[model samples]
Target: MQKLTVGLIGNPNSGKTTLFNQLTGARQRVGNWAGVTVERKEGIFATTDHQVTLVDLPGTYSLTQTSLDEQIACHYILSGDADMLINVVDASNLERNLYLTLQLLELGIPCVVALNMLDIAEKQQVRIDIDALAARLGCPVIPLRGRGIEALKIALDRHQANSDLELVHYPQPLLREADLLAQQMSAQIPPRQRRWLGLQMLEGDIYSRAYAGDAADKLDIALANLSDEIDDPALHIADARYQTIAAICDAVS
Candidate 1:
């Protein structure tokens, strides 16, 4: 079968490095991508049925692109080219980890959530309902302890066996509109592949102007009209998601 790129993303101290070591053994490298200093780590893992390339991306709370490293991670994952995302997260720190999880869902990337530090959660009486968390995330959740090299390798291999993985996206009016336009325009490509263009348009990304023209031209015009009707575009849904994430974190223990 075809090899796939799986990105491991999470906040700092989420046991990502440990997980990487457990899965890839000594077959890893560190470097910079796109001229950024952020550490880029990669390794190849072989499954019983398939082979996958795993990457350890820079840790960040959110993908709003405040710093250069975050922007690079956001760019590649949001670039609409990657095959899948492996969201490594600390189970004890669900709120903070899910912030980035929700953001990845917004970008419509296929995700598999790894609940790292499950052992700690169990000891501290954290009581994480993995089933409920999976339901909310719209993806598969695997509870992992971030150790035991062979066990993690088997788990990763099991997940890689599935060829069809679903992406998660929020239900927003503008997001929906952009999604629809992408469908009509890029009918040749898969619906999920076209979704990145829509997100870029909603984000008003000028650097990716090549995805513009025809229907997008008119859609952008309509978006501007609606924004002009409002007082400020600064408070768009993207910003609101961040605020919502913060509030959710505050509410949770």
Candidate 2:
């Protein structure tokens, strides 16, 4: 039987590893998700008829790759090492955890949202409309408790990427840059995927060099122009993500 490589990611203390423990159980090992020497863990488990290898990504609030931990997770996810992702979201801290959740969608990976800590959220008087959340996410939002584990695996067994799902609406100028940069990039990346790469290049993390060819200088000029135009173009994109999350919270909470 073909095995599945699934990533487990979440904000710190979001019970990312706790789920890993429950899913993988005593069967696990220590290793690197990348050769960057960042420590990592992965384990194999059988879910009904399917075999799965769960990789525990370093707990991170975002995938910006500002730190080594973030880089490992970012590179692993962006490079498409995992067939699918298990986004462990903290239910009590929905807004904060949803930040990473949105980024995962932006990367265009198939995901199963493991909505963690719902019990605690209930204790704290936090109410969430899971059905509304799942509808907006375009993925299964399974509460990480009881029979939901079985459902998560079932969700994983039959997963498909959405048809270019978008979670955030960037500021107009920034969106313009992303669109322009997307057109400038190679056709090797699908028309849908290039916008994501374009946005990353405009934002940061060596992506400017990754895809820019004879147009390197043009890319530089674009960034310089954007810097002149916006107070903080990257942060503006981030702000849009937060605002979208806020809107989702408003609709669901």
Candidate 3:
């Protein structure tokens, strides 16, 4: 069978591990991340034509890498080990969960969203237009349930990638600084990859500095070099993400 690695990621309470168990069954094996002690799990997901290695990445509210788990998640995604991703999202909570979805999509990896807890959403009177949500996210959003697994497997067989869905529109000066830093970092990196790395650093992420290769002090310069009009670049960028999420929820609901 052809082989592929699929990373599973979501917020702390997004039922990501539960979905991992549901998908992988008893084929799971416990392990640790390289050079660290954070728990990792990998299991075999056997389809007729593919041998999928399902890996459960640490839960992260965002990819800013403000903590160890988030840093590990960010680094794991950067390692390029995972061929694709299954982003488990809480269907009941679109606003907060979609924030990470936005970040993961920015990385330009092929992803299939596992929209969990549709029952809860229904009980809570949260009406979501699945087709519209998929269109907005630019990837298949599979509703999670007993029969949904079949559809998820189908989506895994053929997922889509979209880095062009940069929902958040940042201020011009912020984008300019990040662009300047991206050019300074190196020309060898793809423009899209450089854009993500630059934006990550500008959001006050210390974890990505090691990957920046910009001489630690130079990265700090860009972080603090933002327009004074924007008092806090981190918050500014964060609010922009939520603003976009709100817009999606408003339209979908």
Which residue runs of candidate 2 sit more than 4 Å off their true CA positions?
33-36, 171-173, 183-193, 204-216, 224-232
Residue 26 lDDT in model 3? 97
Cα lDDT tens digits, model 3, 54-107, are 999999888771587888888888777888899999988888899888887777
Candidate order by TM-score, highest to lowest?
3, 2, 1
2 against 3, candidate with superior lDDT: 3
TM-score between candidate 1 and the true structure: 0.69
Q: What is the C-alpha lDDT profile of model 2 across 211-237, one tens digit per residue?
A: 544445555777876877775776777
Candidate 3 error regions (>4 Å): 186-190, 220-232
The TM-scores of all predictions, comma-separated, are: 0.69, 0.86, 0.89
lDDT of 1 by residue, 106-201 (tens): 555677788878778878877777766665566667777334444444555455322232333234555655666676554544455456556555
Tell me how far the alpha carbon of residue 115 in candidate 2 is from the true structure, in angstroms, after superposition. Answer: 0.6
Worst 10 residues of 2 by lDDT: 207-216
Q: How does candidate 2 fare on TM-score? A: 0.86
Span of ten consecutive residues with least summed lDDT in model 3:
215-224
Highest TM-score: give the candidate number: 3
